[PDB]
Amino acid sequence: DLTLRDYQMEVAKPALNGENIIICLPTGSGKTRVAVYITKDHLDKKRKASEQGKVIVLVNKVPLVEQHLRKEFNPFLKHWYQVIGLSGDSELKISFPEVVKRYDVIICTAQILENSLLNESVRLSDFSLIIIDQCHHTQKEGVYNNIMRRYLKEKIKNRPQPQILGLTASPGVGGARSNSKAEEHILKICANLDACRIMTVKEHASQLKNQVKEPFKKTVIADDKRRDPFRERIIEIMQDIQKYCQLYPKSEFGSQPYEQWVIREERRAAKEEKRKERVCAEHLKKYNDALQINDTIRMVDAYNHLNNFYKELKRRKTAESPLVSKQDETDEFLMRLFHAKKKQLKELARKPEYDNEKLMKLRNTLMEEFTKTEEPRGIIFTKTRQSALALYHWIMDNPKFEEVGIKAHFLIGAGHNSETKPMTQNEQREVIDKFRGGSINLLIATTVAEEGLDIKECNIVIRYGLVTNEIAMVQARGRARADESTYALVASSGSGAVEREDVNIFRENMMYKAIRRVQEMPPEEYLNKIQDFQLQSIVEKQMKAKRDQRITFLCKNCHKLICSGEDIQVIENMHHVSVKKDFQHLYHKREEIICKDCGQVWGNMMVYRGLDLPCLKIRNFVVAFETTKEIFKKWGELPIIFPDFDY
Amino acid sequence: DLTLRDYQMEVAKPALNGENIIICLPTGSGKTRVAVYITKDHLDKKRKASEQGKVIVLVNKVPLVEQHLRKEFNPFLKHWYQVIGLSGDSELKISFPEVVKRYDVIICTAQILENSLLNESVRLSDFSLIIIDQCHHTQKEGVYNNIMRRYLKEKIKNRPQPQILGLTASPGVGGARSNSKAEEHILKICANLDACRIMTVKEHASQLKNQVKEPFKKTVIADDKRRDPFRERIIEIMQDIQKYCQLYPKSEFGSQPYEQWVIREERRAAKEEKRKERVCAEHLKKYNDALQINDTIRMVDAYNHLNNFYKELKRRKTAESSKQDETDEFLMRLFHAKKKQLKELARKPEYDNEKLMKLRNTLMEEFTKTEEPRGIIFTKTRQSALALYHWIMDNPKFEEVGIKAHFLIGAGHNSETKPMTQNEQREVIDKFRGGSINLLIATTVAEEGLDIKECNIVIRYGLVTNEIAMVQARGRARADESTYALVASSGSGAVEREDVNIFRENMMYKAIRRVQEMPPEEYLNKIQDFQLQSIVEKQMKAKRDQRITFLCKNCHKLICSGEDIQVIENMHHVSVKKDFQHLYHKREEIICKDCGQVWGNMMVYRGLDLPCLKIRNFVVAFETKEIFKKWGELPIIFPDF
RNA sequence: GGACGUCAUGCGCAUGACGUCCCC
RNA sequence: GGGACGUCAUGCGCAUGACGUCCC
Ligand SMILES: Nc1ncnc2c1ncn2[C@@H]1O[C@H](COP(=O)(O)OP(=O)(O)O)[C@@H](O)[C@H]1O
Ligand SMILES: Nc1ncnc2c1ncn2[C@@H]1O[C@H](COP(=O)(O)OP(=O)(O)O)[C@@H](O)[C@H]1O
Numbered sequence A: 001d002l003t004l005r006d007y008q009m010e011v012a013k014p015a016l017n018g019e020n021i022i023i024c025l026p027t028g029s030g031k032t033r034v035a036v037y038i039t040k041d042h043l044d045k046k047r048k049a050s051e052q053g054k055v056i057v058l059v060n061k062v063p064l065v066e067q068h069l070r071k072e073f074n075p076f077l078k079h080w081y082q083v084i085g086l087s088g089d090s091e092l093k094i095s096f097p098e099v100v101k102r103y104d105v106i107i108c109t110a111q112i113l114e115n116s117l118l119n120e121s122v123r124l125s126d127f128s129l130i131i132i133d134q135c136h137h138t139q140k141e142g143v144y145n146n147i148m149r150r151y152l153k154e155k156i157k158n159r160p161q162p163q164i165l166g167l168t169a170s171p172g173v174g175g176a177r178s179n180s181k182a183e184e185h186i187l188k189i190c191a192n193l194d195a196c197r198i199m200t201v202k203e204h205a206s207q208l209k210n211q212v213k214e215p216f217k218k219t220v221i222a223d224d225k226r227r228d229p230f231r232e233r234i235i236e237i238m239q240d241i242q243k244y245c246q247l248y249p250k251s252e253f254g255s256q257p258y259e260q261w262v263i264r265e266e267r268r269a270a271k272e273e274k275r276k277e278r279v280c281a282e283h284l285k286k287y288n289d290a291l292q293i294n295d296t297i298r299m300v301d302a303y304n305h306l307n308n309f310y311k312e313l314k315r316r317k318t319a320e321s322p323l324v325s326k327q328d329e330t331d332e333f334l335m336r337l338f339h340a341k342k343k344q345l346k347e348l349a350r351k352p353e354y355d356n357e358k359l360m361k362l363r364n365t366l367m368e369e370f371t372k373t374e375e376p377r378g379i380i381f382t383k384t385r386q387s388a389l390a391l392y393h394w395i396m397d398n399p400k401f402e403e404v405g406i407k408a409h410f411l412i413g414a415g416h417n418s419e420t421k422p423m424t425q426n427e428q429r430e431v432i433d434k435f436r437g438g439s440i441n442l443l444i445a446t447t448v449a450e451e452g453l454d455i456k457e458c459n460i461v462i463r464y465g466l467v468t469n470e471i472a473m474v475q476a477r478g479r480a481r482a483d484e485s486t487y488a489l490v491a492s493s494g495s496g497a498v499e500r501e502d503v504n505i506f507r508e509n510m511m512y513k514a515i516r517r518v519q520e521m522p523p524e525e526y527l528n529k530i531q532d533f534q535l536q537s538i539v540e541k542q543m544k545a546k547r548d549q550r551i552t553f554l555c556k557n558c559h560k561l562i563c564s565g566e567d568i569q570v571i572e573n574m575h576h577v578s579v580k581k582d583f584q585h586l587y588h589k590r591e592e593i594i595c596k597d598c599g600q601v602w603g604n605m606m607v608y609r610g611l612d613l614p615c616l617k618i619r620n621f622v623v624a625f626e627t628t629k630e631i632f633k634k635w636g637e638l639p640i641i642f643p644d645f646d647y
Numbered sequence B: 001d002l003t004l005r006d007y008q009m010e011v012a013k014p015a016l017n018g019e020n021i022i023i024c025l026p027t028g029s030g031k032t033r034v035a036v037y038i039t040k041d042h043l044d045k046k047r048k049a050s051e052q053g054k055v056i057v058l059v060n061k062v063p064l065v066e067q068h069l070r071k072e073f074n075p076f077l078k079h080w081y082q083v084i085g086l087s088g089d090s091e092l093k094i095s096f097p098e099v100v101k102r103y104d105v106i107i108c109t110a111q112i113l114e115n116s117l118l119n120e121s122v123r124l125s126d127f128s129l130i131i132i133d134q135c136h137h138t139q140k141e142g143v144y145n146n147i148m149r150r151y152l153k154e155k156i157k158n159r160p161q162p163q164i165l166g167l168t169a170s171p172g173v174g175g176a177r178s179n180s181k182a183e184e185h186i187l188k189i190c191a192n193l194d195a196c197r198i199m200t201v202k203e204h205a206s207q208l209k210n211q212v213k214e215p216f217k218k219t220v221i222a223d224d225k226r227r228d229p230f231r232e233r234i235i236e237i238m239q240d241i242q243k244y245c246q247l248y249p250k251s252e253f254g255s256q257p258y259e260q261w262v263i264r265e266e267r268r269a270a271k272e273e274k275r276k277e278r279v280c281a282e283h284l285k286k287y288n289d290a291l292q293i294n295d296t297i298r299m300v301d302a303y304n305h306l307n308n309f310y311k312e313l314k315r316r317k318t319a320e321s322s323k324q325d326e327t328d329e330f331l332m333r334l335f336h337a338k339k340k341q342l343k344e345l346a347r348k349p350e351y352d353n354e355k356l357m358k359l360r361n362t363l364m365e366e367f368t369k370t371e372e373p374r375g376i377i378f379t380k381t382r383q384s385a386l387a388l389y390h391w392i393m394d395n396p397k398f399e400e401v402g403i404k405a406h407f408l409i410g411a412g413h414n415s416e417t418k419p420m421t422q423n424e425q426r427e428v429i430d431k432f433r434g435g436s437i438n439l440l441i442a443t444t445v446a447e448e449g450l451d452i453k454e455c456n457i458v459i460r461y462g463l464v465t466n467e468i469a470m471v472q473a474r475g476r477a478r479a480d481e482s483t484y485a486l487v488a489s490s491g492s493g494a495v496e497r498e499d500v501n502i503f504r505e506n507m508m509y510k511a512i513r514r515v516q517e518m519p520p521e522e523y524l525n526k527i528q529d530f531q532l533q534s535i536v537e538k539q540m541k542a543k544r545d546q547r548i549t550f551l552c553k554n555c556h557k558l559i560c561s562g563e564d565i566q567v568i569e570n571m572h573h574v575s576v577k578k579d580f581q582h583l584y585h586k587r588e589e590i591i592c593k594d595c596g597q598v599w600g601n602m603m604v605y606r607g608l609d610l611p612c613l614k615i616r617n618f619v620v621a622f623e624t625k626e627i628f629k630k631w632g633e634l635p636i637i638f639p640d641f
Numbered sequence C: 001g002g003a004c005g006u007c008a009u010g011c012g013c014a015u016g017a018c019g020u021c022c023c024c
Numbered sequence D: 001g002g003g004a005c006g007u008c009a010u011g012c013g014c015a016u017g018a019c020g021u022c023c024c
């Protein structure tokens, strides 16, 4: 039984009458339900005018396909039309061109559609309604914009195109600081979705107000005026290393500019055969990491970060199943250095009084807010993955949290480009569905929790010194819309984060005023501006179309002669491997492939057709041409390509 | 008779007792008078302890040497000590090492002292008090910081140094947006001047308040909702050119990103022998210039900017004693077709910019409050100063109500507008205090340092820079019933940029209040750390600093080899081949014979008429091609003629 | 005329963190 | 495991304009 609330109608009306539009409805309003109502209405009128009704709903996240089916599309359309959900995760034995022709309502991740459009074929004439979910991403080189680039390309050259629905809560300002540049970004994503209007709940605003409960805002600041024993004890150690190698920073200890400098320094050193310098630079990064860990997490984690790093070196340096020797002077210096000051750090880390202030501010904000209701739920937005896994263990090892009600769990990302190891797509469901059950009470999450996914309503949402953009700001507030909701920001004065959130509050307020002006804009003006942005949106692709249209291997640490370019061959289209048979002797094995001479990590052992072969990563070698030298980050940056192992 | 007011004392006290400090006193308080009182007090105590008293007062501007002498230092110290003023403008036949030894009070531009320190020699032991004027410049690779880098270098290695006075009004925040990074910048320039404290008028704040009259603030915004006929008529013309060459922008018309794009495009085109493209890109810049001129100045100036540009091409293309390409004849005709329309449209006063009517309105009311009022208009570009002058001239109602105006621009030779002489700036500024000139239309030049008369109105005409210059500009208006106005348009972003500076200024006062309240063990340890890394910042620059054919950019002809070019003096590069006489033409200026592109200018050197060549106008071809901006960017150096 | 520095604005590139999608 | 995209922070470079200095 497919109703709409009065505000939902007001926003939908022009889409029901065929106009391409963007829809701005807050989190908890039910923007997807408006999509459903529009697909049906659109499709019914094509039946009743004896015509084609094919509707494709694009998303940016695999769980949103199956979530949009179960909870919105199937219940209201499966029994009248042919509905399907697609993704890369889907195991179908049917090509996408077929799925177009066999189905009426196609929900899928936008890249599935773009993959087909790349190239019997698929094209945008085949659909009559394209609904883009979270359309603020229709921007730059995003998939959504590449789709729309084609649509717009056809429009201008035509002198039979589908209808386009944009779905979002807040379109954004695109990092701008001026009300002029707010307009310009709004108009730009209006222009990318060829919208005849951006659409907001004006006439039924009072009704919307009651549906979504706006939370109570706080900014709990931490003036770090405590003594910082752990900091001081580390900066000592770092200065002892900086003298040893004679590499002096232009930057504060425990900060980004230091981290950038010390990484540039490790590279340069490695390129110039200066082991002593790079090894110290490598170690100096880990110490710098431990400082900023001490700023945010508990200091036992900072300690552990170092302890584990020096534990790893014991395995890689100590031999097993005769040499000049792996253990260098520089290595033995740094190892001893840490082993000397270790006990001090450990016994200092277990003093709870010198743990970070932010943690006591977090503790305080939790304890009061988890004692207002008998069944409360909440989220902590930490910045790094490690800080999620740590704050979990912080809550575990702390009986007062558990006693008052808090049973917590971390919720991180999926990627394989982090030093912390991810969660599976499936493992995220396991938590999030436990969260709505009440099994898990408190999500400690990275950005992952901010957009899209259906997470239970929250009584508290804590941004633990995390600020990103205006969009994510307002998304995070949307996650807390239960009774007596609270949106807290727990930063320190030294961060700059209180002032960055305050700029986002200014930006958000610009965004509402840029929407109010593009709406009030006379149509001759609006038309002429949108056409101009679209004309230059196509030219932005032409400049990238010119951009895109454009030896020996040595151990970074000890500079040994190991491999030629001819010795390396690709497996599949990614795993590069060596084929020489002297090569057996020049590496060692641990639990992982390390240099025999120096114990530097080279890669890992794999199996391929019952053969134990060595994988080599480009991280860990200096490439020598002929003379110029280089460290490349990923294999694709090299100039010559290697042949496949087996032809 | 050398007094101090009660606030001036409070601020000076620790300097009188020998402590290195920075002094923060508003514009109109008399910070220089505190320098005078400190030099005398310092020098008197060295006489009376039978010892060396040598004091060097560094400045950043040549007029401030002669101004500090006349109006502060000589009247109170010439009759008791040996006072002198130095600069690069000074015509002395005496080396600086001598001037050190012969004089007690040495006022000079800081580079004079650094030149000597570079290298009987000069060094910082020779002075006992160094007073740095406008010490907020003691930053980065500024001269003031290179001086202090040496001072700090000696300090750390010593295990007999002078006292150091920092003079400023507002030290700044250094572009920061966080109260954490405000502290960090304050501490950094505290650390560069080795100050024991930043010093502000707290105990006698009420008295200071009365001395300096704080102006009434306004932000007169212009919602440009008018029709813009001139704009539309130009964008038409630019689209006609963009189709012709097939170079399409990724940017708005009449803006910076367009200007950057269209300059990158002219270069690329010139490197790749694509005359058609570059010539259009060159012309497209001039059209883009005329749009942003239309945004700020009157539109007759935008028209004139184009007319004069196409007039120049008539001289360079028409022969005397084929040059005209298809692309050239296309663009020329194109302008000649749409010309009369632009001219007759430009003389319609109703379609001139709104900001000008907002300016007009803000002037007319504020120049009718007092019978003798004075004021300043801070425009952005030099052209917009010279234009707003002519705007006020050609407008009898300004003159009738009292306004007699004049422009006040810069000195440099790196602008498309031609400068004022050091002397010409005095001629205006001293006329301004006389009442001969009523209204200065100035670039940034008027904001810092120079003694300009007090103002009833100061207008920032869509100009915003940093917090420092903001507060400096407010300082220029401290007469009775003073007003500080900002006249920007909603499309600028400038109202919001000034609002960030207002936030930044407020951070600055709070960062000062915290470094002052900071316990000394903490303050010491932070200053020593910034100084330690300030020296390392020089070491990273000390590694940075320690690191073929010539073809006409337009027509790509073979003109000169590297061997054909020889330097005159250490700057004017010139060709010596004698086929070379034929390949250029002469106008009123050296142009290509084939295409009429400007190559340089004719000079005389030992009675020889020789051709100067600028690197702007040639594609350098190795064996790769390149356009270099200035000769020093090339890899091989040429011998002297 | 040359060199150097500072400020504002805009553009581009790099590093790190976070997230996503597609493919094997 | 590879490729692409986006977001945040930081750093670097180039362009335009304005200003200053020093040496010619
Ligand atoms: N017209 C309606 N009548 C009744 N319930 C509705 C209606 N629209 C939406 N809902 C309910 O609200 C839910 C939408 O919540 P949510 O997904 O948070 O909104 P959004 O799509 O804005 O994020 C639906 O799943 C449904 O349970
Ligand atoms: N203690 C004082 N007694 C008398 N006049 C003073 C005193 N201090 C300053 N002045 C006057 O103030 C003028 C200097 O002010 P100004 O240069 O505008 O301030 P600043 O040095 O802050 O730029 C001098 O010309 C002088 O006549």
Ligand SMILES: [Mg+2]
Binding pocket: A030, A031, A032, A033
């Ligand atoms: Mg929903």
Ligand SMILES: [Mg+2]
Binding pocket: B030, B031, B032, B033
């Ligand atoms: Mg003064």
Ligand SMILES: [Zn+2]
Binding pocket: A555, A557, A558, A559, A560, A595, A596, A597, A598, A599, A600
């Ligand atoms: Zn090795």
Ligand SMILES: [Zn+2]
Binding pocket: B552, B554, B555, B556, B557, B592, B593, B594, B595, B596, B597
């Ligand atoms: Zn030529």
